[PDB]
Design a protein around this ligand. Structure first.
Ligand SMILES: OC[C@H]1O[C@H](O[C@H]2[C@H](O)[C@@H](O)[C@@H](O[C@H]3[C@H](O)[C@@H](O)[C@H](O)O[C@@H]3CO)O[C@@H]2CO)[C@H](O)[C@@H](O)[C@@H]1O
Length: 380
């Protein structure tokens, strides 16, 4: 007879300030179970690192990411099924979309701990009323834009997911998960991309890089940032008094066109080749179904609980940041689990790379047509 012993190794791509929150939870857990070491290990290119290490027996026990990898990782045999651990009682602890995010074709491979998307994070010392329409957003942008003094109207990391809200504001889509077809060359999608680079890019420092954009906001050199819960401890460490609201509707002849960001469910995944399964299960189950664990992720970072019970906690119900991300998620599209999405993301990031070579003059329509076809050829 025995106990669970040893180590649980968890790979991730969190930056240090987000990680701190997760490490303090690990430390609590290790206080609860002194015979179990929880070890977090940062990977620059986590998806690449897992693909390479998992099959060779060099991968971790667990890893953290949004849910959309679960389809392609399972098809590649890179995950460990946990069907034997999942029960209806456990499933019923989670919101249905978290219930669905944690499985692929009938097998469970993870536990869910949050919902997320990007939203406007605004600095209350620079913006006293956040924008409820794109027009008010643009006026705030105009008010603060002053590149000569290294001041910009907004901070916004640029990549497929980060600008999907705007790309998809006018009925466009990267991918229709009904028909399972990319939508890059739909006029409404083209309209959304042009809108980003015509209406919003001119107010930015002209770089798509994540930490450069974020640092502009953290340094008070932009009044607003488009980012997710994963960035919130960075905002807090910078001493900024902030709020969170959804990207507001663009108005066209009195009509609203709501930006529609992609969003997702955060999962702790079980990796194929896992060495310490029962210990890793116990930690994950704790992390995802203990009230104080989930309350801590939500109150510290703005993560929206998918642990139903805590949604009724007054601590959670009266919290501004979780409410604002929650409002943003209401307009979000849940990322598909289809492995087809892999080439979609590649196609959209490829188009953005070419647009960024010459954003003011690029032929966005023809680029998008070009990448639609590449996606159509690489989709599987
Ligand atoms: O752009 C294509 C990718 O879009 C999706 O990735 C999203 C994540 O889903 C989302 O969580 C967010 O990731 C951040 C992560 O949460 C945080 O812990 C880490 O420290 O930083 C990440 C951002 O740099 O944003 C990315 C988009 O960058 C999708 O999940 C992924 O498969 C696509 O490749």
């Amino acid at each position: 007879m025995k106990i669970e012993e040893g180590k649980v190794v968890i790979w991730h791509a969190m930056q240090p300030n987000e990680l701190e929150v997760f490490q303090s939870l690990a430390e609590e857990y290790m206080a609860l179970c002194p015979e179990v070491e929880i070890v977090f290990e940062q990977k620059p290119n986590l998806e690449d690192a897992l693909k390479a290490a998992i099959p060779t027996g060099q991968g971790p026990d667990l890893f953290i990411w949004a849910h959309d990898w679960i389809g392609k990782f399972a098809e590649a045999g890179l995950l460990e099924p946990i069907d034997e651990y999942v029960t209806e009682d456990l499933l019923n602890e989670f919101a249905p979309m978290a219930q669905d995010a944690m499985q692929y074709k009938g097998h469970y491979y993870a536990l869910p701990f949050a919902a997320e998307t990007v939203a406007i994070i605004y600095n209350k010392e620079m913006v006293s009323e956040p924008p409820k329409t794109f027009d008010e957003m643009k006026a705030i942008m105009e008010k603060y834009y002053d590149p000569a003094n290294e001041k910009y109207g907004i901070a916004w990391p640029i990549n497929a997911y980060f600008i999907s809200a705007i790309a998809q504001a006018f009925g466009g889509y990267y991918f229709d998960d009904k028909t399972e077809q990319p939508g890059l060359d739909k006029p409404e999608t083209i309209e959304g991309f042009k809108f980003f680079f015509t209406e919003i890019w001119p107010y930015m420092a002209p770089t798509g890089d994540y930490n450069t954009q974020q640092s502009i906001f953290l340094e008070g050199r932009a009044p607003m940032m488009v980012n997710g819960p994963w960035s919130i401890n960075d905002v807090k460490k910078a001493g900024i008094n902030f709020g969170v609201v959804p990207l507001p509707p663009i108005i066209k002849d009195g009509k609203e066109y709501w930006p529609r960001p992609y969003g997702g469910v955060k999962l702790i995944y079980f990796a194929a080749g896992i060495k310490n399964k029962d210990a890793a299960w116990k930690f994950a189950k704790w992390l995802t179904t203990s009230e104080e664990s989930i309350k801590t992720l939500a109150l510290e970072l703005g993560y929206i609980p998918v642990l139903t019970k805590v949604l009724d906690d007054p601590e959670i119900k009266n919290d501004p940041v979780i409410y604002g991300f929650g409002q943003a998620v209401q307009h979000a599209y849940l990322m598909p689990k289809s492995p087809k999405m892999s080439a979609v993301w590649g196609g959209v990031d490829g188009a953005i790379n070419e647009i960024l070579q010459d954003p003011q003059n690029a032929d966005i329509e023809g680029i998008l047509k070009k990448y639609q076809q590449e996606i159509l050829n690489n989709m599987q």
